[PDB]
Design a binder for this molecule. Structure first.
Ligand SMILES: [Cl-]
Ligand SMILES: [Cl-]
Ligand SMILES: [Cl-]
Ligand SMILES: [Cl-]
Ligand SMILES: [Cl-]
Ligand SMILES: [Cl-]
Ligand SMILES: [Cl-]
Ligand SMILES: [Cl-]
Ligand SMILES: [Mg+2]
Ligand SMILES: [Mg+2]
Lengths: 264, 265
């Protein structure tokens, strides 16, 4: 059996690029998928970059990509809120790229005492007072959205905290988890992706480099899952990752290029 | 019971009882003076993870109290000595502030980076940042022995709730699945049994006095000591029933202030 579908939900980091640098076989793979006429949407959990920046990044990899072909957690979070409550007042722990999207969606950036929504995103400049403000917003009982649940972001010099750090802190202090988690493996971003694709899950494959994020995301919407080995998961650690995370992908390929070549 | 039975010793919380931050509570200060005149053994037990024993001694003396080193057991000191006893000169990595670092050094411990540490020591830090949390994460992931100064999730500061040391505990648990191996501060038995061992008294002869049901009353219950709640701090006459209900525990005695407890003997 081959992973031959009408549409593809494709993770960026570890599949198509690593930070600002392209993964050559990932790029080749996406180009050939596009040439075959498949519908593609890139889905990213990035909580600090705007849709604009990631579109520019993909184009710098040599890809032809339109606005509708990228769904990033910053944008998806802002949108989600704007649909619920146009011009909502939001207090955020997050960074400029998230703030950019919140503003583009018509939302008003305010302090915790004025907020209608608490929006948790990662912040490299997080500090004790921002955490105090988030704590108090939490205790006010206002609607609480998180951009993505990632506990640990796998970086080259080692693990660093993800948005999950703030989520964890707030849960421990108040007993409150987010009302809504947007990013993978949440169904929120995934179902929005299906919507944008205009396809049901049976006609979609979800492609990524993390079993706990991408494969779990596919499982959550009942789409077939493809794990590539160009990112976090390797030939060396594959069996251990399957064990650690408790899920097996439907397919494993060295890179996206190999997945596409399996369609011929 | 409106009257207080005569205990040989007292474990007394500071914040909300004797002072609020650097400001004395006159009825608390007077209560301590009177207990000392009665010849009762006293130890102040504080969950403060940012201040050294040196600084809290100075603070109590600034309230006009005559207090010795052995009469204060603060979580910074208690944590450092707990570790040093287990492993003299242990290498430690900490998230804490200068006050904790001071006590760790005074106990003979070596402050090192996360990759060399034998213990992870979690204390609150008002200058907490992403780099420090990265370091803590990595120390935590190594599986090394992990001690927390105190478990307080929320610290009841004068101008509204602020995060406690439990913020960092919470973050690390969520990211790694690990809770501290040992929690030192109240309501943990660790600091409380050390207090009993400084007093040279069994719990049956000691009352534990504080302003928080979830910390001070819980602490006394954990060692089987009678509990006294004063109303000079977090708990008030107005919110008392709400606090019993929220925290799920009843103190043995309630007095408006430490002075009133002492007068009821
Ligand atoms: Cl980035
Ligand atoms: Cl990304
Ligand atoms: Cl392209
Ligand atoms: Cl993240
Ligand atoms: Cl203080
Ligand atoms: Cl204190
Ligand atoms: Cl200090
Ligand atoms: Cl604290
Ligand atoms: Mg990835
Ligand atoms: Mg207190």
């Amino acid at each position: 059996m081959m992973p031959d579908k009408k549409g593809y939900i494709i993770d960026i980091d570890g599949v198509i690029g690593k930070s600002v640098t392209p993964i050559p076989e990932g790029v080749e793979g996406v180009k050939k998928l596009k040439e075959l006429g498949k519908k593609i949407i890139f889905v990213s959990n990035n909580s600090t970059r705007s849709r604009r920046i990631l579109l520019e990044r993909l184009r710098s990899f040599g890809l032809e990509v339109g606005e509708d072909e990228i769904l990033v957690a910053t944008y998806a979070t802002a949108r989600f809120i704007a649909r619920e409550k146009p011009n909502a007042k939001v207090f955020t722990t997050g960074e400029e790229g998230l703030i950019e999207e919140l503003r583009l969606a018509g939302l008003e950036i305010v302090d915790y005492d004025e907020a209608e929504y608490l929006v948790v995103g990662s912040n490299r400049k997080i500090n004790f007072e921002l955490m105090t403000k988030a704590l108090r917003a939490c205790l006010r009982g206002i609607r609480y959205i998180a951009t993505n649940p990632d506990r640990i972001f796998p970086a080259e010099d080692g693990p660093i905290p993800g948005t999950g750090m703030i989520i964890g802190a707030l849960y421990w202090m108040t007993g409150r988890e987010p009302d809504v988690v947007v990013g993978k493996p949440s169904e929120v971003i995934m179902r929005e992706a299906l919507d944008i694709l205009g396809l049901d899950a049976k006609d979609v494959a979800v492609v990524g480099d993390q079993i706990d994020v991408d494969v779990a995301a596919g499982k959550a919407i009942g789409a077939e899952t493809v794990l590539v080995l160009t990112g976090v998961t390797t030939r060396e650690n594959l069996d251990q990752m399957i064990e650690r995370h408790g899920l097996k992908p439907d397919y494993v390929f060295n890179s996206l290029k190999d997945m596409v070549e399996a369609l011929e």
